[PDB]
Design a protein around this ligand. Structure first.
Ligand SMILES: CNCCNS(=O)(=O)c1cccc2cnccc12
Lengths: 20, 336
């Protein structure tokens, strides 16, 4: 399921903003 | 509303032109615990010794801000924050600087990030998500009306207050601009196609980000996600979105209009402006005035045990505060 794919993904924690 | 905002613009313009400066000293507060961290500083729960009040003090290291080229954005954040006033925006109480850092003392929002609750809980029900979305709708309407673009909407930047309502924090990319802008800003998952395509943009990016928010709240995950940003950028410009099987029809269609790659077809950027959103079927039960007044039934109240309680926040290593013998970036931050 997509949810499972998201949970196993590397971007489930707090996302930082992109500067340069 | 038009009438309300008109008055609102007047107040904002007064402060915009005459921003306040150095309204406190570091030694008036008692440093207690880091509530969140960043690139050039951290936010600390602090206590105003004279009043006994608690606040969240954002501390920016001047050298890191310069090293990262964020001077103008930093000047924007403070200038804008001290001039705005709306029920769903954090209040900047004080600001000052010293030899080494820049400080922004804001109202402490005890409820924690929307992010942490969404993660723990999984997903929010449509009604719950709509409660939150409506607040962001009224906020963008207020912000855009003042020629401002937020540019960093995401769960991490939305704080829940004692009343279950939203408090938008982090105005580090906020900019008052009449016309287009070009900076590559934001968080990958929430970036609009125009931004990733380097074409110059406006307010419509704030409306795309809203679509991303509503979707993440309702499904539990973002509409475009991968393990590296480039894979994400790819998906966003692809113009293809798959909706969870539980999304209501009104939601799939409100979202199809918000996540419109073609910003000449994107809700919020059309002929009727924000009305195309407020008048959407998904929001038919929403009483906008009621929500603005905070007289609505908040679906969830994070509960905190007494003032200064920081249990809704994650623990961070305490980096200690240092201040140089020598002034560090005087001219760059003279207007701060
Ligand atoms: C990273 N998203 C910011 C959320 N938390 S924070 O510590 O940076 C933060 C920033 C600004 C105001 C706050 C008020 N109360 C608590 C935390 C506050």
């Amino acid at each position: 399921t997509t949810y499972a794919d998201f949970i196993a993904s590397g971007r489930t924690g707090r996302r930082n903003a992109i500067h340069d | 509303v038009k009438e309300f905002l008109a008055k609102a613009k007047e107040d904002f313009l007064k402060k915009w032109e005459n921003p306040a400066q150095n309204t406190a000293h570091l030694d008036q507060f008692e440093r207690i615990k880091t509530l969140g961290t960043g690139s050039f500083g951290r936010v600390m729960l602090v206590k105003h010794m004279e009043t006994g009040n608690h606040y969240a003090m954002k501390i920016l290291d001047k050298q890191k801000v310069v090293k990262l080229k964020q001077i103008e954005h930093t000047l924007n954040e403070k200038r804008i924050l001290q001039a705005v006033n709306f029920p769903f925006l954090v209040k900047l109480e004080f600001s000052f600087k010293d030899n080494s850092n820049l400080y922004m003392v804001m109202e402490y929002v005890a409820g924690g990030e929307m992010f942490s609750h969404l993660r723990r809980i999984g997903r929010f029900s449509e009604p719950h998500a709509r409660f939150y979305a409506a607040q962001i709708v009224l906020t963008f309407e207020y912000l855009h009306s003042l020629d401002l673009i937020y540019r960093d909407l995401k769960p991490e930047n939305l704080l829940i207050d004692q009343q279950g309502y939203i408090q938008v924090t982090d105005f580090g990319f906020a900019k008052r601009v009449k016309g287009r802008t070009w900076t590559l800003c934001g968080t990958p998952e929430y970036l609009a196609p125009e931004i990733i395509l380097s074409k110059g943009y406006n307010k419509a990016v704030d409306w795309w980000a809203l679509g991303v928010l509503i979707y993440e709240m309702a499904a539990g995950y973002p509409p475009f996600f991968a393990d590296q940003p480039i894979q994400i950028y790819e998906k966003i410009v692809s113009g293809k979105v798959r909706f969870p099987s539980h999304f209501s029809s009104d939601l799939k269609d409100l979202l199809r209009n918000l996540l419109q790659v073609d910003l000449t077809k994107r809700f919020g950027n059309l002929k009727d402006g924000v009305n195309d959103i407020k008048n959407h079927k998904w929001f038919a039960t929403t009483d906008w005035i009621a929500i603005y007044q905070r007289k609505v039934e908040a679906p969830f109240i994070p509960k905190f045990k007494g003032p200064g309680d920081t249990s809704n926040f994650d623990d961070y290593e305490e980096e200690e505060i240092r201040v140089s013998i020598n002034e560090k970036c005087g001219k760059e931050f003279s207007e701060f």
